[PDB]
Amino acid sequence: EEAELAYLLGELAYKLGEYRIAIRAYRIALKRDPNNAEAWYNLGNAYYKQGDYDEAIEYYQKALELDPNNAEAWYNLGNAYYKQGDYDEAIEYYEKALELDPENLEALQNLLNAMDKQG
Amino acid sequence: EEAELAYLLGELAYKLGEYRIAIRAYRIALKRDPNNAEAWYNLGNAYYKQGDYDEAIEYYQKALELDPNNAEAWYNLGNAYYKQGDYDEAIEYYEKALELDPENLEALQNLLNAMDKQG
Amino acid sequence: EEAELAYLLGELAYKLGEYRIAIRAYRIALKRDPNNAEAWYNLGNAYYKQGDYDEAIEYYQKALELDPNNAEAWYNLGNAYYKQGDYDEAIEYYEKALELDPENLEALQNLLNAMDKQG
Amino acid sequence: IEEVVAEMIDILAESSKKSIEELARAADNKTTEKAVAEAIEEIARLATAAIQLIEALAKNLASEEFMARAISAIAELAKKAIEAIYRLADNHTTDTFMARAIAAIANLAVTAILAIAALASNHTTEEFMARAISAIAELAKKAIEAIYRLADNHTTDKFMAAAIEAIALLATLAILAIALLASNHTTEKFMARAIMAIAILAAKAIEAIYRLADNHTSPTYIEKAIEAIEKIARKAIKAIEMLAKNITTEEYKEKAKKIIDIIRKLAKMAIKKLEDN
Amino acid sequence: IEEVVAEMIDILAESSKKSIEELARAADNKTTEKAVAEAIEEIARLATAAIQLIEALAKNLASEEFMARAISAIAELAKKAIEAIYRLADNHTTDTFMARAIAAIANLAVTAILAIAALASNHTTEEFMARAISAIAELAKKA
């Protein structure tokens, strides 16, 4: 099962902070299995960690289509939009993350900040 | 040789303490090559480290059928039985580990303790 | 793409200092793709790090045939020859590394030392 | 005339800033705690006096451009005094002079804020009132952060309660000062800005308190932190409602409600976590 | 507006009163004369500053009910500062810090009295002016 090994290599490298490696390994795992929502999410996270926000947004969105209840992905999607200055989108996604998980204090604070920057 | 890569990923993750990853990688390596005694042994060790003693026992036993001279596996098999309260078995396996390696002080001490708990 | 995963596993293990693992993974990556100059180079480096200078020389030479502008490989090829006492070769390779990169202070110093040991 | 009054203000401000820097340098290069204590008190004493002289002169400036310059001079001096104290007073194994630093920072922030509001109330243009609101909010945030950071540099929980109370004080007065100036706005655009300024400051005050209280097991600090958090939310919300009542465009009232609900959630969530500790 | 200004005054007054009590406690439990000297000066310094901030805010209160609250806040803080100093500064074999205590008490009384008169002059009702007179007389007697 090359797809699982690709996944495992990706996860190990990711956990160790070796994002360059993690990205290549996840691309392989996903090429073989496009429905791996977790790999899409972590692929997006590796880009996010590198400041590659455009990629982080695309991949977070795919992970969410596969799994709409991933509150953390909603939160980070909002964060990437926020970082790019897209406050209208940041608000929309922080609100979803909170509906799924009201305990996310960071989302509440970032939500309020996005509202300040908005218009 | 996917089986060797699975083995290598397993060993790297194991060495780094990432037992969750090591287990999945070893299962793949063994699925492809059931005679890999070393992988069976390390598979059992990863479970042992996690407190998963029932699995550690099964896998240690398989590694030993493939390689009866593995004193360390005999020792750890005895330890898993000991941890579960099976003192009769712990005694039997500590004795074998010692026949293979008389220098194992821990086995001697655990052997005596198992004898105390026995009956 | 097993060859890429083999490469990635090799690079991760190498970076972490697990040269035993890195070597086996690189051998697999190269078996599948003999033109991977970078893998040849890092394969040679893992041996170099272990004191396995004969292997380090062979693999550095292959990496260089594939990529003659690799100043670092020229430098390390010279270092392996130097370590074995082959000062005539060490001189030849330090000079090439310097032609490619004049800033390599270590090559200049080692070059002068090789000249002292020479004849 | 305005030129003369404004020049006198700029002169006093430059003299005061230089003196603060020199006091800090004089003590920063010493190994004597007493030298530092004197610099902490002298910086605060000087900045306070300078602010009061500026206010007295600033009252003779009828023009908005000039009042804005006076406000800036006060705000700049006050923030410089706070930074000088934060650095000057840091470390000391966290056992010596932390109480002085907290009190000094909070006291300077109070004087500067009230002084700004005192002058700011004479602007008749919403744009200028908005600038004053920002100046108050920025001073309040800087004072809160300096106090917060000193409190978390601590090696032991000595004086964390002072930090908790000082933050609650500054946030409460700054909120009221904003509401006070904001009560003179007539356009929803500006009323909305005042509401966000309050909400944000309230959120920052709550988070700083929460984090300090949540850093270690501390049942009596938890009791203080919880009341401070609820207190801040009460003041922030009432201020928002008072301003919100003057909005007649609806969409803006909906936004004010969202803001209030966010504040309520922040207070409740922060409290629940502190209660569980 | 009056509600806001009045609230700010009450807040400053409560903070100031607590701090005076704490300074007195911190020094009351010490055996070092210097700790006491600092508390004597800090109580007076603080109360003086607090009074001045209250006066500045109080000037924005046109309503008599609110001015009366501001007057009370000044008077209450001033008398608390005086009591704290009296107790804090007592004894000391009567050789140490009596001069500081006398000056501090008299100076606080002067600041508080003049500040009250400054606000009190804006009442237009005889009943309120009478309250201010009483407040002044009580501070003078306590000092």
Author numbering:
A (entry chain A), B (entry chain A), C (entry chain A): 1 to 119
D (entry chain B): 1 to 277
E (entry chain B): 1 to 143
What's in the article?
We sought to develop a general computational method for de novo designing protein nanoparticles with geometries tailored to present antigens of interest, focusing specifically on the prefusion conformations of the trimeric viral glycoproteins HIV-1 Env (BG505 SOSIP), influenza hemagglutinin (H1 HA), and respiratory syncytial virus (RSV) F (DS-Cav1). In the second step, we generated tetrahedral, octahedral, and icosahedral two-component nanoparticles by designing secondary interfaces between a designed trimer (fusion component) and a de novo homo-oligomer (assembly component). This design approach yielded nanoparticles tailored to present 4, 8, or 20 copies of the viral glycoproteins in defined geometries.
As secondary assembly components were required to design our antigen-tailored nanoparticles, validated trimers were docked pairwise with de novo designed symmetric homo-oligomers to generate tetrahedral, octahedral, and icosahedral nanoparticle configurations using the TCdock program. Five designs comprising a panel of unique geometric configurations, T33_dn2, T33_dn5, T33_dn10, O43_dn18, and I53_dn5, ran as monodisperse particles of the predicted molecular mass by SEC-MALS and were further investigated by SAXS. The experimental solution scattering curves closely matched the scattering curves computed from the design models for all five designs (metrics in Table 1 and Figure 2—source data 1, bottom five designs). In order to obtain higher-resolution information, three designs, T33_dn10, O43_dn18, and I53_dn5, representing one nanoparticle from each targeted symmetry (T, O, I), were subjected to cryo-electron microscopy (cryo-EM). There is less evidence of flexibility in T33_dn10 and O43_dn18, in agreement with the higher final map resolution for these nanoparticles. Nanoparticle design models were relaxed into the corresponding EM maps by applying multiple rounds of Rosetta relaxed refinement and manual refinement in Coot to generate the final structures. Backbone r.m.s.d. values estimated for the asymmetric unit (consisting of a single subunit of component A and component B) were 0.65, 0.98, and 1.3 Å for T33_dn10, O43_dn18, and I53_dn5, respectively. The self-assembling cores of the antigen-fused T33_dn2, T33_dn10, and I53_dn5 nanoparticles were very similar to the NS-EM maps of the unmodified nanoparticles (at least to the resolution limits of NS-EM), demonstrating that fusion of the BG505 SOSIP trimer did not induce any major structural changes to the underlying nanoparticle scaffolds.
